[PDB]
Design a protein around this nucleic acid. Structure first.
Lengths: 195, 146, 49, 48
DNA sequence: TATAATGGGAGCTGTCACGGATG
DNA sequence: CATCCGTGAGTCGAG
């Protein structure tokens, strides 16, 4: 398994970091296997299906919401039905307030559980849409969910050999002049890091 | 009881990876859940099916002839589901190794190297496991890892 | 009790005021989060260490 | 140190061959990485 | 090599003066 | 202008 020369990685300024415009701390989480790194993406194939991929993701987002508003309804039914059942028993009205706040606690949880799913489903679609070389996906379960769904659309790897891949598909001549353009611009702090 | 703060706080810590190469491996193991006695049996059942579909096709490739597209595909899936089960059991009792790998610390060989070789014995352990005897996996493992 | 014991000074009053969070649970969790990141914060795991 | 690397390089070989889960294989690799690192420049990264 | 066994463990202590990256 | 990490801090000899 390929392995990176520590002289070029940990020596500051981090030569590898500068080369790939990768962060010194982000480089770490990669080489030593703490965070996956996107290696290459078929942007075209993404585009030519982006319309259909959106609709599909959408249907899941709807079907998640639909259960939520349904699940919530049935609890609201039984919340009102129980409050009256303890009323037919003639319980103290204060003893019903316990049952009241109980329901409102259960419904909140339900909504939050669903909402977390929808936020995850959001964080998934957002991430896939805006995917590109040199992106770090530190969250694992996302990346697993990211491969399972759209694994045909990009190339994700991890560790010292992924960084090997990044160097192969590195265009020196291109990345060079690109730095010279930021140099031609007066903007100091960004000219600093481009110098 | 469960605040939104904690729920955000928990994912923040868990997501960040520590600097200690030892700790970072521990945290990885704690993900998969320990196995129920009958859960262990299940995987054993699958691996047996999985391990066997493989031995079928192995000698067949040498002799030549092969299964139809319907049989081979159905045969092939067991071979995958099996090789997937095996990987699950290993990840389950991956704690077990590190349990009795701490005990050989400070003996002229590193902790991690101890745990690895440890896992290396665990891989052989799950292969020759048998669920016919009602013994949990943990006992036929320990003797193999040690 | 914080106001009681250390109230004679303005620097401690200025401290309890600028205090970010309150609550016995939220304090233990807070310290746990800054001591050992990478580990799930139980209310029983921050009380223990 | 050389004896350290080759021990971990070889152990990777056996692991890859045996078809180990990714959690095990990667752990070796990571170790292999710190082992080459420790030999080239010790103490630079992490504890010596 | 079949009872069952499932997440580590020592930390290290009293510098000093500087450049570069960050603020 | 003030922090954090990594790198300097005399020579020979002796045991």
């Amino acid at each position: 398994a390929p392995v990176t020369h520590i002289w070029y990685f940990k020596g500051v300024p981090s030569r590898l970091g500068y080369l790939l415009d990768l962060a010194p701390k982000d480089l770490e989480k990669i080489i030593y296997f703490a965070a996956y790194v996107i290696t290459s993406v078929d942007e075209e194939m993404r585009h030519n299906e982006l319309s259909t991929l959106e609709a599909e993701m959408a249907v899941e987002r709807k079907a998640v919401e639909d259960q939520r508003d349904g699940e919530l309804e049935a609890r609201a039914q039984k919340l009102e039905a129980d409050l009256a059942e303890l009323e037919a028993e003639g319980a103290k009205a204060d003893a019903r307030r316990k049952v009241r706040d109980g329901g409102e606690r259960e419904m909140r949880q339900i909504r939050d559980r669903a909402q977390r799913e929808l936020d995850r489903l959001e964080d998934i679609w957002s991430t896939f849409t805006k995917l590109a070389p040199k992106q770090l996906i530190v969250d694992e379960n996302l990346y697993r969910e990211l491969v399972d769904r759209y694994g045909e659309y990009f190339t994700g790897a991890m560790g010292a050999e992924s960084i090997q891949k990044l160097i192969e598909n590195f265009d020196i001549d291109a990345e060079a002049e690109s730095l010279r353009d930021v140099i031609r611009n007066g903007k100091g702090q960004k000219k600093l890091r481009a110098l | 009881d469960e605040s939104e703060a904690l729920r955000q706080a928990r994912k923040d810590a868990e997501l960040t990876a520590s600097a200690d190469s030892v700790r970072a491996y521990l945290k990885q193991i704690g993900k998969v859940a320990l196995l129920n006695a009958e859960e262990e049996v299940e995987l054993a059942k699958r691996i047996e099916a999985g391990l066997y579909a493989t031995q079928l096709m192995t000698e067949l490739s040498e002799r030549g002839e092969k299964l139809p597209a319907a049989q081979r595909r159905d045969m092939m899936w067991i071979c995958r589901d099996g090789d997937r089960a095996k990987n699950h059991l290993l990840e389950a009792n991956l704690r077990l190794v590190v349990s009795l790998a701490k005990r050989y610390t400070g003996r002229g060989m590193a902790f991690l190297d101890l745990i690895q070789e440890g896992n290396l014995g665990l891989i052989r352990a799950v292969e020759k496991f048998d669920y016919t005897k009602g013994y949990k996996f943990s006992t036929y493992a320990t003797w193999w890892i040690r | 009790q914080i106001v009681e014991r250390f109230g004679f000074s303005e620097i401690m009053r200025s401290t309890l005021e600028k205090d970010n969070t309150v609550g016995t649970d939220e304090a233990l969790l807070d310290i746990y989060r800054k001591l050992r990141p990478g580990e799930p914060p139980t209310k029983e795991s921050a009380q223990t260490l | 140190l050389y004896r350290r690397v080759i021990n971990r390089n070889n152990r990777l070989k056996r692991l890859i061959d045996l078809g180990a889960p990714e959690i095990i294989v990667n752990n070796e690799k990571r170790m292999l990485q710190e082992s080459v690192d420790a030999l080239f420049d010790n103490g630079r990264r992490g504890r010596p």
